[PDB]
Coordinates of C-alpha atoms and ligand atoms in Angstrom, one line a residue:
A6 CA 3.9 1.5 -28.2
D7 CA 1.1 4.2 -28.1
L8 CA -0.9 5.2 -24.9
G9 CA -3.6 2.7 -25.6
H10 CA -1.1 -0.1 -25.9
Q11 CA 1.3 0.5 -23.3
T12 CA 1.0 -1.6 -20.1
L13 CA 2.2 -0.7 -16.6
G14 CA 5.6 -1.6 -15.8
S15 CA 6.5 -4.8 -13.9
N16 CA 8.1 -2.4 -10.9
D17 CA 5.7 0.2 -11.2
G18 CA 3.9 0.3 -7.8
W19 CA 1.2 -2.0 -6.3
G20 CA -0.5 -2.0 -9.4
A21 CA 2.2 -4.3 -11.0
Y22 CA 1.5 -7.2 -8.2
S23 CA 0.7 -10.7 -9.5
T24 CA -1.1 -10.6 -12.8
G25 CA -0.3 -6.6 -13.2
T26 CA -2.0 -4.2 -15.0
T27 CA -2.1 -4.6 -19.1
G28 CA -5.7 -3.2 -19.4
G29 CA -7.0 -3.6 -22.8
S30 CA -3.3 -3.5 -24.6
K31 CA -3.9 -7.2 -26.2
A32 CA -7.4 -5.9 -27.7
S33 CA -8.2 -7.5 -31.4
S34 CA -9.2 -4.9 -34.0
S35 CA -13.2 -4.5 -33.4
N36 CA -12.4 -3.7 -29.5
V37 CA -10.3 -0.7 -30.3
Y38 CA -12.8 2.5 -30.3
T39 CA -12.3 6.0 -30.7
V40 CA -15.2 7.8 -28.8
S41 CA -16.4 11.6 -28.7
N42 CA -19.5 11.5 -27.2
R43 CA -21.3 9.9 -24.1
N44 CA -23.4 7.7 -26.4
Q45 CA -20.3 6.6 -28.4
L46 CA -18.4 5.9 -24.8
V47 CA -21.3 4.1 -23.4
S48 CA -21.4 1.8 -26.3
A49 CA -17.8 1.2 -26.2
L50 CA -17.8 0.2 -22.6
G51 CA -20.9 -1.9 -22.9
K52 CA -21.8 -4.0 -19.9
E53 CA -19.8 -5.9 -17.2
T54 CA -19.9 -9.0 -19.6
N55 CA -17.9 -6.9 -21.8
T56 CA -14.7 -8.5 -20.6
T57 CA -12.7 -8.6 -23.9
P58 CA -9.6 -6.7 -23.9
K59 CA -10.4 -3.2 -25.1
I60 CA -9.0 0.2 -26.0
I61 CA -10.8 3.4 -25.8
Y62 CA -9.5 6.5 -27.2
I63 CA -11.1 9.7 -26.0
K64 CA -11.3 12.6 -28.4
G65 CA -12.2 15.8 -27.3
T66 CA -14.5 16.7 -24.7
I67 CA -17.2 14.3 -23.4
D68 CA -20.0 15.8 -21.3
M69 CA -21.8 13.2 -19.4
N70 CA -24.8 15.3 -18.1
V71 CA -26.5 14.9 -21.8
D72 CA -29.6 13.1 -22.9
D73 CA -29.4 10.5 -25.7
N74 CA -29.6 12.9 -28.3
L75 CA -26.6 14.7 -26.5
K76 CA -28.6 17.7 -25.2
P77 CA -27.3 19.0 -22.1
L78 CA -29.1 18.1 -18.7
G79 CA -29.5 20.3 -15.7
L80 CA -31.4 20.2 -12.2
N81 CA -34.9 20.6 -13.5
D82 CA -34.2 17.7 -16.0
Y83 CA -33.2 15.3 -13.2
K84 CA -35.3 16.6 -10.5
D85 CA -38.1 14.3 -9.1
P86 CA -41.6 16.1 -9.4
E87 CA -41.6 16.3 -5.5
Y88 CA -38.2 17.8 -5.0
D89 CA -37.6 21.7 -4.3
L90 CA -34.4 23.0 -3.0
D91 CA -36.4 25.7 -1.0
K92 CA -38.5 23.2 0.4
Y93 CA -35.5 20.9 1.3
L94 CA -33.7 23.5 3.0
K95 CA -36.8 24.6 5.1
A96 CA -37.6 20.9 5.9
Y97 CA -33.8 20.2 7.3
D98 CA -33.0 23.6 9.0
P99 CA -31.1 22.8 12.1
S100 CA -33.1 25.6 13.7
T101 CA -36.4 23.8 13.4
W102 CA -35.3 20.0 12.3
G103 CA -32.5 19.9 14.9
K104 CA -29.8 17.4 14.2
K105 CA -31.8 14.0 13.6
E106 CA -31.2 12.7 10.2
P107 CA -33.0 14.4 7.1
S108 CA -36.1 11.8 6.6
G109 CA -39.7 12.5 5.0
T110 CA -41.1 14.0 1.7
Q111 CA -37.9 16.2 0.7
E112 CA -35.3 13.8 1.6
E113 CA -37.1 10.9 -0.3
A114 CA -37.4 13.2 -3.3
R115 CA -33.6 14.3 -3.0
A116 CA -32.6 10.7 -3.2
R117 CA -34.7 10.0 -6.1
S118 CA -33.3 12.9 -8.0
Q119 CA -30.1 12.0 -7.3
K120 CA -30.5 8.6 -8.7
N121 CA -31.9 10.1 -12.1
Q122 CA -28.7 11.9 -12.3
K123 CA -26.5 9.0 -11.3
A124 CA -28.0 7.0 -14.3
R125 CA -26.3 9.7 -16.9
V126 CA -23.2 10.4 -15.1
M127 CA -22.1 7.3 -13.8
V128 CA -20.4 4.6 -15.9
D129 CA -18.9 1.3 -15.1
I130 CA -15.6 0.4 -16.5
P131 CA -15.5 -3.5 -17.5
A132 CA -12.4 -5.9 -17.1
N133 CA -9.4 -5.4 -19.5
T134 CA -10.0 -1.9 -20.4
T135 CA -7.4 0.8 -21.7
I136 CA -8.9 4.3 -21.9
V137 CA -6.7 7.0 -22.7
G138 CA -6.9 10.5 -24.2
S139 CA -5.9 11.3 -27.5
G140 CA -3.8 14.5 -27.9
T141 CA -3.8 17.1 -25.3
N142 CA -7.4 18.1 -24.9
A143 CA -9.2 14.7 -24.1
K144 CA -12.0 15.5 -21.3
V145 CA -14.5 14.0 -19.5
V146 CA -16.9 16.8 -17.8
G147 CA -19.2 15.6 -15.1
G148 CA -18.8 11.9 -15.4
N149 CA -18.0 9.4 -12.7
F150 CA -16.0 6.3 -13.9
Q151 CA -16.6 3.5 -11.6
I152 CA -14.2 0.4 -11.4
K153 CA -15.6 -2.7 -9.9
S154 CA -13.4 -4.7 -12.1
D155 CA -9.9 -6.2 -12.7
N156 CA -7.4 -4.8 -15.0
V157 CA -8.0 -1.3 -16.1
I158 CA -5.6 1.6 -17.4
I159 CA -6.9 5.0 -17.4
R160 CA -4.4 7.6 -19.0
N161 CA -4.1 11.2 -20.3
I162 CA -7.4 12.5 -19.6
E163 CA -9.0 15.7 -17.9
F164 CA -11.4 14.7 -15.6
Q165 CA -13.5 18.1 -14.5
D166 CA -16.3 18.9 -12.1
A167 CA -18.2 15.5 -11.0
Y168 CA -21.0 17.5 -10.1
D169 CA -23.9 16.7 -7.9
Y170 CA -27.3 18.6 -8.3
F171 CA -28.7 17.1 -5.3
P172 CA -26.0 17.2 -2.3
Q173 CA -27.4 15.6 1.0
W174 CA -27.5 17.5 4.4
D175 CA -26.0 15.6 7.3
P176 CA -26.5 17.8 10.5
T177 CA -23.9 15.4 12.4
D178 CA -21.2 15.2 9.8
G179 CA -18.9 16.8 12.1
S180 CA -19.9 19.3 14.8
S181 CA -21.9 21.6 12.6
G182 CA -22.9 19.3 10.0
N183 CA -22.0 19.1 6.4
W184 CA -23.0 18.7 2.8
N185 CA -22.2 15.4 1.1
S186 CA -22.3 14.7 -2.5
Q187 CA -22.1 11.4 -4.6
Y188 CA -19.7 11.7 -7.6
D189 CA -16.0 11.2 -7.9
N190 CA -14.0 11.5 -11.1
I191 CA -13.1 7.9 -10.5
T192 CA -14.4 5.3 -8.0
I193 CA -12.7 2.4 -7.6
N194 CA -15.2 0.1 -5.9
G195 CA -13.6 -3.3 -5.2
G196 CA -11.5 -2.7 -8.5
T197 CA -8.1 -4.3 -8.8
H198 CA -4.9 -4.2 -11.1
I199 CA -5.6 -0.5 -11.9
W200 CA -3.2 2.2 -13.3
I201 CA -4.3 6.0 -13.2
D202 CA -1.5 7.8 -14.9
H203 CA -1.0 11.4 -16.5
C204 CA -4.5 12.3 -15.9
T205 CA -5.8 15.7 -14.3
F206 CA -8.5 16.1 -11.9
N207 CA -10.2 19.7 -11.4
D208 CA -13.4 21.1 -10.7
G209 CA -13.7 22.4 -13.8
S210 CA -16.1 25.7 -14.3
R211 CA -17.9 25.1 -11.1
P212 CA -15.3 25.4 -8.4
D213 CA -16.4 25.3 -4.7
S214 CA -15.9 29.2 -4.7
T215 CA -19.0 29.4 -6.8
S216 CA -21.4 27.5 -4.3
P217 CA -23.3 29.3 -1.5
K218 CA -23.1 28.1 2.1
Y219 CA -26.4 26.9 3.5
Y220 CA -26.5 26.4 7.1
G221 CA -23.2 28.0 7.4
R222 CA -21.6 25.0 5.2
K223 CA -20.6 24.9 1.8
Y224 CA -23.3 23.6 -0.6
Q225 CA -20.9 20.9 -1.8
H226 CA -21.5 19.5 -5.2
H227 CA -18.5 17.5 -5.6
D228 CA -16.9 14.4 -3.7
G229 CA -13.7 12.5 -4.6
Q230 CA -11.0 12.8 -7.2
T231 CA -9.8 9.2 -7.2
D232 CA -11.4 7.3 -4.0
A233 CA -10.9 3.6 -3.4
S234 CA -13.2 1.4 -1.5
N235 CA -14.5 -2.3 -0.6
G236 CA -11.4 -4.3 -1.0
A237 CA -10.0 -2.2 -3.7
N238 CA -6.4 -3.4 -4.3
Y239 CA -3.2 -3.4 -6.5
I240 CA -3.5 0.2 -7.8
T241 CA -0.8 2.6 -9.0
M242 CA -1.5 6.0 -9.5
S243 CA 1.3 8.1 -11.1
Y244 CA 1.9 11.5 -12.7
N245 CA -1.5 12.9 -12.1
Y246 CA -2.5 16.5 -11.5
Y247 CA -5.1 17.0 -8.9
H248 CA -6.0 20.7 -8.4
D249 CA -8.7 23.2 -7.3
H250 CA -10.8 20.5 -5.2
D251 CA -11.5 19.8 -1.6
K252 CA -11.4 15.9 -1.0
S253 CA -9.0 14.6 -3.1
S254 CA -8.5 10.7 -2.2
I255 CA -10.1 8.8 0.2
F256 CA -8.9 4.9 0.4
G257 CA -11.2 2.8 2.6
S258 CA -14.4 4.6 3.2
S259 CA -15.3 3.1 6.7
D260 CA -13.8 2.1 10.2
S261 CA -16.2 -0.7 10.3
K262 CA -15.0 -2.2 7.0
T263 CA -12.2 -4.3 8.7
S264 CA -12.3 -6.4 5.3
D265 CA -10.2 -3.7 3.9
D266 CA -7.2 -4.8 6.3
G267 CA -4.4 -6.5 4.1
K268 CA -6.1 -4.7 1.0
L269 CA -6.0 -1.0 -0.6
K270 CA -2.7 -1.6 -1.8
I271 CA -1.9 1.7 -3.7
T272 CA 1.2 3.4 -4.9
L273 CA 1.0 7.3 -5.4
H274 CA 4.1 8.6 -7.1
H275 CA 4.7 11.8 -9.0
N276 CA 1.4 13.2 -8.5
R277 CA 1.0 16.9 -8.3
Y278 CA -1.6 18.3 -5.5
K279 CA -2.5 22.0 -6.1
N280 CA -5.0 23.8 -3.9
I281 CA -6.1 20.6 -2.5
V282 CA -8.2 20.8 0.6
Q283 CA -7.5 17.3 2.2
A284 CA -7.3 13.5 2.0
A285 CA -4.1 13.3 -0.4
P286 CA -4.7 10.5 0.3
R287 CA -6.8 9.8 3.4
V288 CA -6.2 6.1 4.2
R289 CA -7.6 3.5 6.5
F290 CA -6.3 -0.1 6.7
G291 CA -4.3 -0.2 3.4
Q292 CA -0.3 -0.5 2.8
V293 CA 0.0 2.7 0.9
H294 CA 3.3 3.7 -1.0
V295 CA 3.4 7.5 -1.3
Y296 CA 6.6 8.9 -3.2
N297 CA 8.0 11.8 -5.0
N298 CA 4.7 13.6 -4.7
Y299 CA 4.4 17.6 -4.7
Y300 CA 1.9 19.2 -2.7
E301 CA 1.4 23.1 -2.8
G302 CA -1.4 25.3 -1.4
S303 CA -2.2 27.7 1.2
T304 CA -3.9 27.6 4.5
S305 CA -5.1 31.2 3.9
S306 CA -6.7 30.5 0.5
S307 CA -10.3 31.8 0.0
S308 CA -11.2 29.0 -2.6
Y309 CA -9.4 25.7 -1.4
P310 CA -7.7 26.2 1.6
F311 CA -4.9 23.5 2.7
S312 CA -5.9 21.3 5.5
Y313 CA -3.8 18.3 5.6
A314 CA -1.9 16.2 3.0
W315 CA -1.9 12.8 4.6
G316 CA -4.7 11.2 6.7
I317 CA -3.4 8.7 9.2
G318 CA -7.0 7.0 9.4
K319 CA -7.7 3.7 11.2
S320 CA -4.9 1.1 10.8
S321 CA -3.3 2.8 8.1
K322 CA 0.1 1.7 6.8
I323 CA 1.5 4.7 4.8
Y324 CA 5.0 4.4 3.5
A325 CA 6.1 8.0 2.5
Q326 CA 9.4 8.9 0.7
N327 CA 10.9 11.8 -0.6
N328 CA 7.4 13.9 -0.9
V329 CA 7.7 17.7 -1.2
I330 CA 5.1 20.1 0.7
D331 CA 5.0 23.7 -0.1
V332 CA 2.5 25.1 2.2
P333 CA 3.7 28.6 3.9
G334 CA 3.7 28.8 7.7
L335 CA 2.6 25.2 7.9
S336 CA 4.1 23.3 10.8
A337 CA 5.6 19.9 10.4
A338 CA 2.9 18.3 12.5
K339 CA 0.2 19.6 10.5
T340 CA 1.3 18.2 7.3
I341 CA -0.9 15.3 8.4
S342 CA -4.2 14.5 10.0
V343 CA -4.4 11.6 12.6
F344 CA -7.6 10.1 13.1
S345 CA -8.5 7.4 15.8
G346 CA -7.1 4.1 15.1
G347 CA -4.2 5.9 13.3
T348 CA -0.9 4.9 15.2
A349 CA 1.8 4.5 12.5
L350 CA 3.5 6.4 9.7
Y351 CA 6.7 5.4 7.8
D352 CA 7.8 9.0 6.2
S353 CA 11.6 9.7 4.8
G354 CA 13.0 12.7 2.9
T355 CA 9.8 14.7 3.5
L356 CA 10.7 18.3 2.7
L357 CA 8.3 21.1 4.0
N358 CA 8.9 24.4 2.5
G359 CA 12.5 23.7 1.7
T360 CA 13.4 21.8 5.1
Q361 CA 13.9 18.4 5.8
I362 CA 11.0 17.4 8.6
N363 CA 9.8 14.0 10.2
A364 CA 6.0 14.1 10.1
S365 CA 5.8 11.0 11.7
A366 CA 7.7 11.9 14.8
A367 CA 6.1 15.4 14.7
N368 CA 3.1 13.4 15.3
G369 CA 4.3 10.8 18.1
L370 CA 3.4 8.1 15.5
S371 CA 5.3 4.9 15.2
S372 CA 7.9 5.0 12.4
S373 CA 7.2 1.4 11.3
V374 CA 4.4 0.1 9.2
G375 CA 5.3 -3.0 9.1
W376 CA 6.3 -3.6 5.3
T377 CA 8.6 -1.8 2.7
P378 CA 7.7 -1.5 -0.9
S379 CA 9.3 -3.7 -3.2
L380 CA 7.4 -2.6 -6.5
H381 CA 8.7 1.0 -7.3
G382 CA 10.7 2.7 -10.2
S383 CA 13.3 5.0 -9.3
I384 CA 13.1 7.5 -6.5
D385 CA 14.0 11.0 -7.1
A386 CA 16.0 13.0 -4.5
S387 CA 13.4 15.2 -2.7
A388 CA 15.5 18.2 -4.2
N389 CA 14.2 17.5 -7.7
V390 CA 10.4 16.4 -7.1
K391 CA 8.9 20.0 -7.4
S392 CA 10.4 20.3 -10.8
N393 CA 9.8 16.8 -12.1
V394 CA 6.3 16.9 -10.9
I395 CA 5.4 20.3 -12.1
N396 CA 7.1 19.5 -15.4
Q397 CA 5.7 16.1 -15.9
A398 CA 2.3 15.4 -13.9
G399 CA -1.1 15.5 -15.6
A400 CA -2.9 15.2 -18.9
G401 CA -1.3 16.5 -22.0
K402 CA 2.3 16.4 -21.0
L403 CA 2.2 13.2 -23.3
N404 CA -0.4 13.0 -26.1
Ligands
LIG513 O1 -15.6 6.7 -0.3 C1 -16.4 7.9 0.1 O2 -16.5 8.7 -0.9 C2 -16.9 8.4 1.4 O3 -17.3 9.5 1.5 C3 -17.8 9.6 3.1 O4 -16.6 9.6 3.9 C4 -15.4 10.4 3.7 C5 -14.8 10.0 5.0 O5 -14.3 8.6 5.1 C6 -15.6 10.1 6.6 O6 -14.8 10.2 7.6 C7 -16.2 11.6 6.2 O7 -15.0 12.7 6.7 C8 -15.0 13.6 7.8 C9 -16.0 14.5 7.6 O8 -16.8 14.5 7.0 C10 -15.2 15.8 6.3 O9 -16.0 17.0 6.5 C11 -13.7 16.0 6.7 O10 -13.7 16.8 8.0 O11 -12.9 14.7 6.9 C12 -13.5 14.1 7.9 C13 -12.4 12.8 8.0 O12 -11.6 12.6 7.1 O13 -12.7 11.6 8.5 O14 -16.6 12.2 5.2 C14 -15.7 11.7 4.2 C15 -16.5 12.8 2.8 O15 -17.2 13.5 2.9 O16 -15.9 12.3 1.7 C16 -19.0 8.8 3.1 O17 -19.5 8.9 4.6 C17 -18.8 7.4 3.2 O18 -19.8 6.6 3.3 C18 -18.3 7.2 1.8 O19 -19.1 7.4 0.7
CA514 CA1 -18.5 14.1 5.0
CA515 CA1 -17.2 11.0 -0.1
CA516 CA1 -16.4 9.2 -3.3

């Protein structure tokens, strides 16, 4: 079968659980689309009621920041009449505003502006849908696919630059504050039975090295690459190439969201993370199988410096096997970041700079996460992960 009609293998990660992930493989003839612009993509997807099995082939580049006539849209097109970046910056400067939450005219105008862009860039994927790239050059630019539904396959697409014209300032996000933006390449918001395979995720033409710092903090226009939230469950992400991006994959969006416990069952395998800063993945609560992934970067990089690979967040249950991390000078301990509530990590065969390490022991974590994955394909020897992943991960490696 071609990529449009292929289903997730019956053993291929958490996505294969129960009813499995078949996406739109069973689509009848009038439910197979080929789309080459935003108008065509939106028409094909339809609304949440569009639950028939459907296949969507993406041909070439789909820019999501466009109007109904496909004319490109920018900051000034989206901007609320009351919003002004200079006045936003002056309103909320820590020096005069302090550390209280931005409120009042400029923040309300920014929030309205942000909703104006969201209306164009964010698109919901309905149940029983396969979206695949035709050829080696299928691209989604500026777009945020949201999956709240069940049974969705996304393959062979390069997602670039999910860009927010209206980052919000948070003075109490960390000790010196942070700017936060809204758009991921893919947001799994309570979505279930999902396969993301052979995709590429990057910051396109506008990497973070092109944004200034305001209040000493990067004016961050991006958010996640593949995020999973609000009871998202039964997901396989395989052979994807994540590169040149800050916060990659946050699974579980809140320590308060205790309903995520027993959910966020996600398998990550054969993914490449090159020049990714953090959250690869960052996990709260979930039983996440992480195997045969390759991580490569530099702590001294001026564009996207490596901070950590795995985020051991509150009640996380990461099961890691034969992953390979190549970050010069990095200690075994610093491969991961442990957050409050995170006490356990299973990792075997972890290679750091060619040397076998124990990331869990190096961080005083428990070695048991209370589960062992039964749904997985063949496990590569760590010795072969770098070659296999570089050669195979990402869009355009199949077509
Ligand atoms: O699903 C989301 O995108 C999620 O994003 C925010 O949260 C994440 C993370 O869950 C938060 O803990 C927070 O991260 C911390 C710092 O802000 C960040 O600079 C870095 O140091 O990591 C910290 C951490 O891992 O805890 O912010 C994250 C982010 O900016 O994406 C939203 O707060 C959350 O509501 C949700 O949208
Ligand atoms: Ca943040
Ligand atoms: Ca975020
Ligand atoms: Ca997000």
